Write a protein that binds this ligand. Structure first.
Ligand SMILES: NC(=O)C1=CN([C@@H]2O[C@H](COP(=O)(O)OP(=O)(O)OC[C@H]3O[C@@H](n4cnc5c(N)ncnc54)[C@H](O)[C@@H]3O)[C@@H](O)[C@H]2O)C=CC1
Ligand SMILES: NC(=O)C1=CN([C@@H]2O[C@H](COP(=O)(O)OP(=O)(O)OC[C@H]3O[C@@H](n4cnc5c(N)ncnc54)[C@H](O)[C@@H]3O)[C@@H](O)[C@H]2O)C=CC1
Ligand SMILES: NC(=O)C1=CN([C@@H]2O[C@H](COP(=O)(O)OP(=O)(O)OC[C@H]3O[C@@H](n4cnc5c(N)ncnc54)[C@H](O)[C@@H]3O)[C@@H](O)[C@H]2O)C=CC1
Ligand SMILES: NC(=O)C1=CN([C@@H]2O[C@H](COP(=O)(O)OP(=O)(O)OC[C@H]3O[C@@H](n4cnc5c(N)ncnc54)[C@H](O)[C@@H]3O)[C@@H](O)[C@H]2O)C=CC1
Ligand SMILES: NS(=O)(=O)c1ccc(Cc2c(-c3ccc(F)c(C#CC4CCCC4)c3)nn(-c3nc(C(=O)O)cs3)c2CC2CC2)cc1F
Ligand SMILES: NS(=O)(=O)c1ccc(Cc2c(-c3ccc(F)c(C#CC4CCCC4)c3)nn(-c3nc(C(=O)O)cs3)c2CC2CC2)cc1F
Ligand SMILES: NS(=O)(=O)c1ccc(Cc2c(-c3ccc(F)c(C#CC4CCCC4)c3)nn(-c3nc(C(=O)O)cs3)c2CC2CC2)cc1F
Ligand SMILES: NS(=O)(=O)c1ccc(Cc2c(-c3ccc(F)c(C#CC4CCCC4)c3)nn(-c3nc(C(=O)O)cs3)c2CC2CC2)cc1F
Lengths: 331, 331, 331, 331
């Protein structure tokens, strides 16, 4: 008698099961940028959104649903309860505490660990086979936390790491050379942010090593100060933060690129934070960024970059510092 | 002798000239949502951003630039000076002031008028042949204001209008019927927001009229309450505003859909606000949403929807109301 | 000691389980146009090709693989043995025998049944849960054949049907009106080919029914001859065959559009051939195109289009024809 | 009284001027593969087709046109008269003769030259500022012939060259490494096809030089015989030709990739054929593939790849062979 049954004859009432589902936890500026980027790249058939602030969560969900006409992701759901995240192929963690003015980063990482304490078991309960992509900072430490709490094998726990750092690097290099960043190749590895390691030997266009072409590259004998490109990779992040309060658009796009490789089993190589024990001279359980092959099972393989002595020592120092701080985290 | 010259032989020094350039004025949540959606749909070879808040403007520009690796838009610029907007094909106006504590809406519209009196002359000086897409609210009033200041012919002054309302309507229609909104068809015309007009006679799936199938559609006698579907088109917008403070993603996606038809000369039909004097019985210079054919010259044609007497009398009342405000706006 | 192990460290050694796999059976012009459109829409994570001409099958596969740099489908395989098709979500049948000089449709129809008698068991063997998409002609008859041999439920056997006929309808309509085909709405139903049925009541732009505007529309007394559009729907296909020997691009694109809704669970509405017994006054097991809601389970629902007596009578006449031909098929 | 006029009110009837128009001359398998690939990447607002076979030309045009519902390119035109190509931004030449049974290859090149003597002045006539992308074989010779006939500056005459050979190289490299070809970097330079030169020093994943890890890379004394990978770049093409009669899909995709850089002004680096006189040690007016920066003015820059002694000598010997042949041709 209703219009819907007058218009439409149902011939199979199967409960709908998602097949390419993505969950984003934390709907701040970063989570929503990941969300819109994943939606506009058609990477999911279902998107779930989780936060603890219920009205903002519901409003962001509704705002996306109102753009359904223009998308190809037919189901967008949200809620504070994690039943909405069930059977996600990929869970992306962008949640974190709001830093208060004058607050110590030392205090802040424990507050983010405490958040992860609640989030990770809930994610695991409802998506035991999902891949975890950790974006929240400090991302290398938090990816280790996520790995420990979840009990997942290391291939399924991935930190955003230096993927964004390397994208900034290629942007800046492209600005210097007058070439699209796609054609400027260069790798920033190790810790996300201040302590990242530029691998000068690998910087190239068309397979032409800039370092070989210009041996003073990365030194203080470099008349053009190309080391400043890596200083600017770090400083431009702080400048964005200073100018608009936070960063969001570039990390969103870089996360979607990662999601693309995982969701479509592409086996592209990206610089992401992975559990690096037993490689590159690391003897402890820590996560640092190295080139990783990304696909349907997460990190199936990584690339062993040859590093200088200087670059190796910086990685090992990062590893030591990460391990020592992690041993002081309260789980 | 520089690294750049050792690597690259230059054979051509030709001034770069953008071919598919889009400017967004106002980098609030709405302007930036338009920007990211336009960027991810590859609609522009150059994007320019303008605002009066200089640090926020530079930070948003830089944040987009850092994701250049993942985009196909090779140049992103910004500035408070409109020389960065020169020779835009399309300029999208998302600038406005913010209501103060208990500020009157009539006083707020005049403040937005004062803003357009600065913006529009500056746009026209640098892109005298662009199309203007007005998004700021009240959008039908402000589209007329932009038209009168610009001196543009009506085909190149377009108000976002009911494109978003209609998209919300199809999401809500689709939720009732269990059908993707792309396959749900239905038009909301007239003013954006409170006074919009649902055209029940046009509501259909597979060319099957719901109204002819269910003659109570749109009436108060209807026990299925299909009028609520249009009530939700207005109410769900106020609810998003209440829940997250503003709306952004849906308007950004819908503006990008409009930009796509314009920039690709698609001649798709969209409900947008256009100077409607001489149609639907209206005799004053006002802008209201009707179905418009959109392409490289803006609005080249419009669809003459048959309206009932009730629907037609709502368009007339809206026109009279718009006319009465505009005569008392100072610009 | 090898280069591969020197450069790459393997952490995961897990078998490759395909996730969004598509098979195309028959790599003639139609099968390869479906293949390229599927590849360029990023619809599959693995594409499988099958034919009985082994040289042509390998050359097509290798040609596609040589373009892998520009695609997002990392696995393309081919084989005469159906183990390569295992665990497909969607299996597309574009296979058929080549018409000889002087042979009629009634000489060739059984040759294609012989084809389907070999294909369909091997397909069902290695992908028991796949959705079947029948493109081969006579498409309505062959979908019945596939349905009977497969033993699949009616929701999982889809005939390409009048999807292409309707696409041509909307192109021709848009040509007359100067509107993009996307904004021109119109439905050709029933049999693919000569006996297809245009639903005049469904033709509209912006929800404005052309029939109401123009009562003679679809009649012989039409001074504007709007019946000729459907005549051209049929004649344009013969004209393309006469001119280039066959048709391939438009059917390729329409098949990829169908695949999109199925693989992404969009629940869009398309005119496709489905087992219509018990609906639309049909009383025999025959496949005719009606608007079907397409998703992860195939046809989960269909739209009940209200027909005129003339349109309904022709649907029964088609149903009578198919059933009488089907009684003469050798299984 | 006309239905279109009752339905649609026209506000401007300005003449349509296409803004991002691409022409493809030659609608064989290669030209049509270029068309569909360009169509599915939305690179053009108008696509023009030219051939001498008038029936085949019209049928391909119509076949594409019937898929307009699924495309974002509103105008598809064709004709034997170059009027339809007017104001193309990009003209792609895929025209050529069929070698008669036992026809000497040198007599065949003259015949393709005679084709170009007809095509190129007609192209220049109707699109004097277009970029010319030459695909027909022998492509390096014919690109020179197009440049000499057209009178165009070097930056606007581009041969497809080794862009396809390098895509094949990266595919083969990726299959050996278990990595997506996108992340496999490697450059094939010089002549298209048999005499192409692999640049082993450029081969890398994540900036890790395979030559530095595995010094035997490219030698005859190579344990793993990586020289076969370049040999397979050449033999795989002949194999596709032998197996299916011709190659089409991969060249179509590579050409669409070049078009994307040119039409969007990306300044990506591609190995394409360019007038190499005065560079890489060459003294003759010949075209050879080097890494070129591609944008809205064609080739504005190229990368100066450091070559080993024998790569440089093979490139010098290729220039010598092309010049001697270009001396034997009449145009
Ligand atoms: N790895 C990288 O390259 C980058 C990482 N980030 C990091 O992403 C994180 C988020 O950045 P913003 O969006 O700007 O922060 P934000 O504070 O604006 O948003 C974070 C959201 O997490 C939510 N939250 C807190 N506890 C939660 C809990 N148990 N469960 C669910 N949600 C919870 C919060 O309600 C908040 O909405 C930060 O840690 C940031 O440093 C940002 C840019 C670059
Ligand atoms: N028509 C539609 O369907 C929709 C329209 N809107 C409207 O979009 C407009 C912007 O929305 P929000 O981003 O949320 O507000 P917002 O206030 O956060 O952003 C406004 C930006 O405009 C800038 N501005 C003010 N004066 C300027 C001037 N002379 N020149 C350049 N920039 C100037 C402001 O600095 C601000 O950054 C509002 O008017 C809103 O009502 C919102 C959603 C739907
Ligand atoms: N439903 C629709 O709207 C349309 C359907 N079609 C139909 O698609 C079918 C194919 O069209 P074309 O590619 O032009 O024909 P085609 O003759 O060029 O290719 C058909 C391929 O099927 C192969 N074949 C024969 N028996 C086979 C078997 N057991 N297993 C696997 N492969 C087998 C053949 O070797 C051939 O390569 C035709 O029936 C055509 O009428 C074409 C356009 C419109
Ligand atoms: N550069 C590369 O890497 C590759 C280039 N090719 C080359 O592309 C060319 C075409 O390949 P196919 O389509 O397979 O050959 P085809 O012979 O099937 O098509 C060539 C078309 O050019 C047309 N033609 C001949 N003279 C003409 C004239 N004055 N004006 C206009 N059209 C004319 C012909 O009618 C023909 O349809 C060949 O030369 C082939 O070697 C193919 C793949 C790889
Ligand atoms: N490898 S690690 O130990 O994991 C690690 C340590 C420090 C940081 C800094 C940091 C932080 C950050 C937020 C909040 C924090 F609480 C901490 C911390 C800490 C402790 C960890 C050891 C002692 C204190 C950190 N955020 N953040 C951001 N980056 C962006 C971007 O767009 O790139 C935006 S914000 C940065 C990167 C800075 C360039 C902007 C990151 C990080 F990855
Ligand atoms: N046709 S018109 O006169 O052009 C016109 C009049 C009133 C409104 C309401 C309005 C307004 C709005 C902001 C600020 C204002 F100052 C005025 C006003 C006024 C005067 C002139 C009429 C009465 C005093 C209005 N914003 N806004 C927004 N919509 C969205 C969305 O996401 O859809 C987000 S905000 C809405 C639409 C509501 C559903 C949310 C819109 C409008 F189009
Ligand atoms: N409803 S049905 O019985 O299923 C059915 C019956 C007849 C046809 C005709 C037909 C056929 C066709 C090829 C080969 C055949 F053997 C038969 C048959 C048969 C038997 C079953 C009726 C009596 C012997 C058919 N192909 N074909 C093509 N269409 C296109 C296009 O681009 O649209 C390209 S080819 C057409 C459509 C014509 C416009 C070209 C189609 C069809 F769907
Ligand atoms: N540098 S150049 O002088 O420009 C030049 C010389 C020879 C060739 C070979 C050639 C040819 C070809 C067709 C027809 C021809 F007539 C000639 C010739 C010649 C003369 C030259 C010296 C004396 C007679 C050539 N086609 N072709 C094709 N490639 C593909 C693919 O998919 O890669 C498909 S066909 C190839 C590349 C081979 C892998 C198949 C290419 C070429 F670029």
């Amino acid at each position: 008698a209703t219009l819907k049954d007058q218009l439409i004859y149902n011939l199979l009432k199967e409960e709908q099961t998602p097949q390419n589902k993505i969950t984003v936890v934390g709907v701040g500026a970063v989570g929503m940028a990941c969300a819109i980027s994943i939606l506009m790249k058609d990477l999911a058939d279902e998107l779930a959104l989780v936060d603890v602030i219920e009205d903002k969560l519901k409003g962001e969900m509704m705002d996306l649903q109102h753009g359904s006409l223009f998308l190809r992701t037919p189901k967008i759901v949200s809620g504070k309860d994690y039943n909405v995240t069930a059977n996600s192929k990929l869970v992306i963690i962008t949640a974190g505490a709001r830093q208060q003015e004058g607050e110590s980063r030392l205090n802040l990482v424990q507050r983010n660990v405490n958040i992860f304490k609640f989030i990770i078991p809930n994610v695991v309960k409802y998506s035991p086979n999902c891949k975890l992509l950790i974006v929240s900072n400090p991302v290398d430490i938090l990816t280790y936390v996520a790995w420990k709490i979840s009990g997942f094998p290391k291939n399924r726990v991935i930190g955003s790491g230096c993927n964004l750092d390397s994208a900034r690097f290629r942007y800046l290099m492209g600005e210097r050379l007058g070439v699209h960043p796609l054609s400027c190749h260069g790798w920033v590895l190790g810790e996300h942010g201040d302590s990242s390691v530029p691998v000068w030997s690998g910087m190239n266009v068309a397979g032409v090593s800039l370092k070989t072409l210009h041996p003073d590259l990365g030194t203080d004998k470099d008349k053009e100060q190309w080391k400043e490109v890596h200083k600017q990779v770090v400083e431009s992040a702080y400048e964005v933060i200073k100018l608009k309060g936070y960063t969001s658009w570039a990390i969103g796009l870089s996360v979607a690129d990662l999601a693309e490789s995982i969701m479509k089993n592409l086996r592209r190589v990206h610089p992401v934070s992975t559990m690096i024990k037993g490689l590159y001279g690391i003897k402890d359980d820590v996560f640092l960024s190295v080139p990783c092959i990304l696909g349907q099972n997460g990190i199936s393989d990584l690339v062993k970059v040859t590093l200088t002595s200087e670059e190796e020592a910086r990685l090992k120092k990062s590893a030591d510092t990460l391990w020592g701080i992690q041993k002081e985290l309260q789980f």
